[PDB]
Amino acid sequence: MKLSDLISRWIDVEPSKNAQIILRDRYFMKDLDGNYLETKWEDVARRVARVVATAELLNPSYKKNEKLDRIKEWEDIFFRVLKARLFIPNSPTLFNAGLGVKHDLLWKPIDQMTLEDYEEIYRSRNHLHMLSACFVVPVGDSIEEIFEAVKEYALITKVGGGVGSNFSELRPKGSFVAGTHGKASGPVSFMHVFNSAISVVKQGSRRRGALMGILNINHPDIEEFIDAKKVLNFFNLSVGFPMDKKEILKLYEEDGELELSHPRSTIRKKVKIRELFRKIATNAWKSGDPGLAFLGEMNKYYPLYPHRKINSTNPCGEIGLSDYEACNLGSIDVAKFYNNGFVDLEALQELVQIAVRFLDNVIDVNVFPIDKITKAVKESRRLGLGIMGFADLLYKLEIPYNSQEARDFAANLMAFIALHAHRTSYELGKEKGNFPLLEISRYRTEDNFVPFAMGMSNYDDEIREVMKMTKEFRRNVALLTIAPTGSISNIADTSSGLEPNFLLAYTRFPLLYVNQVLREKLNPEILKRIEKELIEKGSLKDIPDVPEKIKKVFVVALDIDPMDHLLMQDAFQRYVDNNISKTINMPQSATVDDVLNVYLEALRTNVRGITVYRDGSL
Amino acid sequence: MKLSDLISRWIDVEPSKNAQIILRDRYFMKDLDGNYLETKWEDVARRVARVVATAELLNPSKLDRIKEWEDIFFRVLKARLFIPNSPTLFNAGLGVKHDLLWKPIDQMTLEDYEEIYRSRNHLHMLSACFVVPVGDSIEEIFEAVKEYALITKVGGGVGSNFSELRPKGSFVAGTHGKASGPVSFMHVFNSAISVVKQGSRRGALMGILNINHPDIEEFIDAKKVLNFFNLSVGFPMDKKEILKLYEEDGELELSHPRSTIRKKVKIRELFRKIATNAWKSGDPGLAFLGEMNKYYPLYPHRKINSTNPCGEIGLSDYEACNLGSIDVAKFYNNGFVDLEALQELVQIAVRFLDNVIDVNVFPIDKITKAVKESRRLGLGIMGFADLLYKLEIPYNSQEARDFAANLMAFIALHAHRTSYELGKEKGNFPLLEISRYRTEDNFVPFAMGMSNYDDEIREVMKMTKEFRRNVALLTIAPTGSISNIADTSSGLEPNFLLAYTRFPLLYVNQVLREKLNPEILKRIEKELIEKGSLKDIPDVPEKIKKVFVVALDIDPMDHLLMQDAFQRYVDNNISKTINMPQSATVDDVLNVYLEALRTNVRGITVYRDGSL
């Protein structure tokens, strides 16, 4: 069906009470006095649609004598899609769109807008008008560069972004410092200063996982890094693997040794790569940290490598970024695309096109806190279009999350989105101009470059064809990711990202959720009966008088074994040009050897990173 | 006896084994390979002398002249008559080719000196102490954090007043949130220095919060963490007003311009809070900022907000100070202070310090500007208590305090005189014209009132209206390290002990050795070392007991008044610890604070014996 008619099915479905609570708390805009300027999700949709549509002022293919009509049409489409909650951008977009703008412009009826209204909106965006989820900054091996980075952590966090850094440039603890004949404190000690800095800045104010800290596997302090949180409470930590995944797996299988060294230290040491891995798995087994960041694999698919290089991800790992780049994210709720036993691909393709344009327009009205960021964003125009609602979609389709059927369905779904997002990038590049670095990227300098592995869909040949087309026109260096969508999946009343539902029924602080699809497919008699058990046990698995058919479809995270989590991640990653946020859930009974096996399997698959969490470990 | 003869009696006197340990530890220059470039104290005087005499290149009033100054610098340095703050000893010559810094002087060409001047690197930081502003924004706060790290890297201390930071809980418009407050941000500064060192840092920082800041009470209790900070309470108002409010049992309004947070508190209760904390742990101190500006020649165009970590210098934003001290114990001669020799060395010292500026490389450009615009110097003394010993003058006496004020007045006179000459010879400091030396008749940068020297000083300040090289010239620093180098007592402080064991070689005060009969010392020593004093020890000549007093023999008020005597003739501030007996109460501490408001002291630090 047409997207316009799908919109009609959803646009007047009101957010749940839980959703409305979240909206009131953090998203509805207020004046300096704490009075609400917005009271309904509708208000947010109008404000955000209007600010992002304003980007069309800059569109060189519109004559001035048509800009108003064209801008208005885009506000209209952005508004309807947002109000329907078919696509929602990353939280900072919702928070900060319209900061600096006269309040009598942000919500006025669209039929009353003038060209001058849109220009006033565009001109009055203030320095807090920061619409991206996160960033990566370099940390150079000097007191000067380190405290400059600390300053940037502070500035970025203030306006609401998260930040990642690879700290491997910092020379090992005890290395010679020529200026003082002294000893270097090493990356880990310095990370404590970054943590301390963030402790006094809020947005505010819950800042859990606001930072990413990576140290490479061959750094002389890697063993200390691995043991760091066992404070650094605002960091997520990952071990960086800049070499090819194949080379590290071969080294493990051969029981080889890794040379730990640094180009500005005499500190050198050899460690058994198996012992190192076991130390990593042992810590992950206990606490869930550190994760693994396959940087080499990110660079294999980075269209600007080696001119530019990915050294770090953002805090939740889903985007590998070069220095001073940002996360520009937004997600489609694919559960709203279910139609009588299938996914409405006609409506989905239209929304993919609209969503790419929306995210790309966000760049134009984004205001960054640092000059170098503005430059790096404009030069590559990297986007992060993702999905949520995936687990709920499978519930509707009656497909077990832990099945090859689901993984085949995922790869094909994702290949379809990638195809149409990249085709849109081509179109936008023809319309508005290519990303300035296109001419030096592998889309132009190389034959048959494709920014992901593929190999699991009937769309591959069509994808190859479009990638060839983008040699000539391309708006964006990359377009896709799958984010946690922790807050925005709640606003959308759907399951988060690509993850299975963690629980079918639970109480949060104090109303109880019950999965909506479960309510529609399970006999209302049986439900009222088993609701008690379900909440206590956290699964349908071992409940009598529950049809085997629904037990199979309605699996939760811990019903699904780790390899099925990992293989789902691989199925998606084959058709994503950035990365993916995915927790590999493991049962309490899991061993350190079990964790090692996940790592080894990960190395053979196409994933670009790994996070595991053992139930009960924390 | 004239400076030349005095140098002859000292120039060939080697540093003690004790002092030699300090020098081989961290003063002798090494390769990046770790090898010794310098092995004896004289090798140090050669480098430093030659580098500072390079400044004469800039002298608009030329190879014979530079060499001249290097010689006189060298001789006074080698004889340990005068010594610059440690960073000058550490960092002089950094970046300069080793073939230039030591080779025989008669082998020096003009080519050579110009090369030294050109090749001074970014580590060539020759000053002890800095002050930097911390503005009320995340941007300014973290720019200041970076500044702390950069200054600490090159070997400097740094101080700030954190009063501009709005109080904990205040509104932040940019986030609609709540401010963390000054004390929370100070923790970030502390963490920063935690990972930075010039070789390995106690009291590297000064943190001041003003008495009327709404978080003043949290700040007073801040340390009970911030291990690299010394803390002081700031009094930007006149000492008179606070004494008044205290005597009237008045109330102080706590407020901040960027907060709606405000509060009334009894001023006596705030003082008692301070005293109790000080009584427990020696912090925080009092900084009478208003009194510093009172004598600040550039007030209010520029304004003193903070001191360095030891408090002896009141600095406006981004200023530094290069200190150097004269060992007065070496000027003892036949029951007199050799005013002839001492005078020559003062002129030389002022020139030396003023030259250090020209060859100094600062880590930040706003600092280079501040230093070059005012040319503030900090010339001081060490060996004072040992001088009293030689003069057989009890430290805790009116004779001591009168002698002290006279010594200092004398130094003050000749220092400000030489600043007139150098101002004539090299040009005035750029802000002369807007300073009170020109804009008001009868401005004097200290209180005086304790010497017959005052009248001439009043005249020399007047001639200063036309020619003056430096905005102010004098300080008394702790001289912790340089006094041990000079084998003498530190700063203006009485000796803390007459006998202690350096490991297992014993030491007894070099001068006590001469006045006392060796036979008595052999017996006495045992008890002296356990009691840390001679006042109760049986069969010690009364005149010996009263002359060779140590810090704890001298009561709180006599320490304070000694600080007053010196301060009347110091245009900057003074480092002085007011020691108190272990049996002191919080009330005794309060009385010291109240007395200090009545004297001319610009700051106060107290330490109760055995509190830590």
Ligand code: B12
């Ligand atoms: C998004 C997210 C995050 C983000 C949240 C910020 C963001 N970028 O959106 C960040 C990066 C903070 C994060 C971190 C971690 N998370 Co998480 N996270 C999620 C996720 C996907 C959504 C949560 C959410 O926003 N819900 C909606 C909001 C509106 O409700 P909320 O009540 O305000 O949510 C808050 C809490 O969930 C909290 N939180 C997030 N993760 C965790 C983990 C633990 C152990 C705790 C106590 C709290 C907590 O942060 C939220 C506010 O930002 C859920 C999965 C799920 N089923 O919900 C997990 C989930 C709670 N996380 C989990 C885990 C294990 C972790 C980590 C231990 C992973 C790691 N590598 O270390 C860390 C813990 C860090 C710490 N200091 O404790 C598990 C915990 C399982 C369990 N049995 O408790 C979950 C269920 C994912 C999973 N599939 O297992 N997470």
Ligand code: B12
């Ligand atoms: C200079 C100095 C300082 C400097 C040292 C660096 C510098 N500016 O060069 C600073 C600012 C760090 C300082 C601080 C304090 N000091 Co102090 N300091 C001195 C002084 C004048 C010189 C000693 C020295 O360096 N000797 C030569 C060097 C080469 O040998 P050293 O053994 O390596 O010296 C080190 C120790 O003395 C140490 N140190 C300095 N002060 C203190 C205080 C205590 C309690 C301890 C354990 C160590 C210590 O720092 C030196 C190296 O930098 C002496 C007075 C004296 N007559 O010696 C005191 C002295 C040791 N300090 C004293 C006191 C009380 C303090 C403070 C508590 C005061 C305060 N306001 O907080 C603090 C303690 C801070 C802390 N973290 O413990 C008293 C201690 C009395 C006692 N019963 O032990 C002394 C004896 C001075 C006095 N007038 O009473 N001090």
Ligand SMILES: Cc1cn([C@H]2C[C@H](O)[C@@H](COP(=O)(O)OP(=O)(O)OP(=O)(O)O)O2)c(=O)[nH]c1=O
């Ligand atoms: C100066 C200094 C550096 N470091 C660390 C921070 C950086 O990781 C690293 C380099 O610091 P730098 O600031 O580059 O020190 P430097 O330039 O004087 O010395 P070099 O020529 O050897 O670079 O050493 C400390 O841990 N403590 C210190 O005091």
Ligand SMILES: Cc1cn([C@H]2C[C@H](O)[C@@H](COP(=O)(O)OP(=O)(O)OP(=O)(O)O)O2)c(=O)[nH]c1=O
């Ligand atoms: C942003 C932020 C500021 N602050 C403090 C730092 C400064 O002391 C003070 C000002 O911060 P600023 O960074 O200057 O805040 P702002 O400009 O966005 O808001 P305003 O106009 O109200 O100044 O608040 C916090 O404590 N936490 C924070 O998260």
Ligand SMILES: Nc1nc2c(ncn2[C@@H]2O[C@H](COP(=O)(O)OP(=O)(O)O)[C@@H](O)[C@H]2O)c(=O)[nH]1
């Ligand atoms: N500073 C900060 N950044 C965050 C936080 N949560 C998320 N981010 C950024 O947003 C990314 C993904 O969060 P996600 O759950 O998908 O976004 P959401 O649904 O808008 O909350 C993280 O990797 C960070 O880059 C936070 O609590 N603090």
Ligand SMILES: Nc1nc2c(ncn2[C@@H]2O[C@H](COP(=O)(O)OP(=O)(O)O)[C@@H](O)[C@H]2O)c(=O)[nH]1
């Ligand atoms: N960073 C730093 N600064 C210091 C240190 N010791 C002294 N200073 C600075 O020098 C001033 C007094 O030092 P002083 O002991 O008189 O000089 P020294 O004998 O040469 O070490 C203090 O106010 C500080 O500003 C130190 O250990 N670290």
Ligand SMILES: C[C@H]1O[C@@H](n2cnc3c(N)ncnc32)[C@H](O)[C@@H]1O
């Ligand atoms: C629960 C959420 O926490 C994020 N998360 C936590 N730690 C890491 C990490 N080290 N690397 C990548 N993502 C992480 C996951 O991406 C997941 O979505």
Ligand SMILES: C[C@H]1O[C@@H](n2cnc3c(N)ncnc32)[C@H](O)[C@@H]1O
């Ligand atoms: C031992 C040395 O410590 C310095 N010192 C320690 N703390 C302070 C302070 N808070 N204010 C001024 N000086 C201080 C004293 O000036 C003394 O000279």
Ligand SMILES: [Mg+2]
């Ligand atoms: Mg460097």
Ligand SMILES: [Mg+2]
């Ligand atoms: Mg501000």
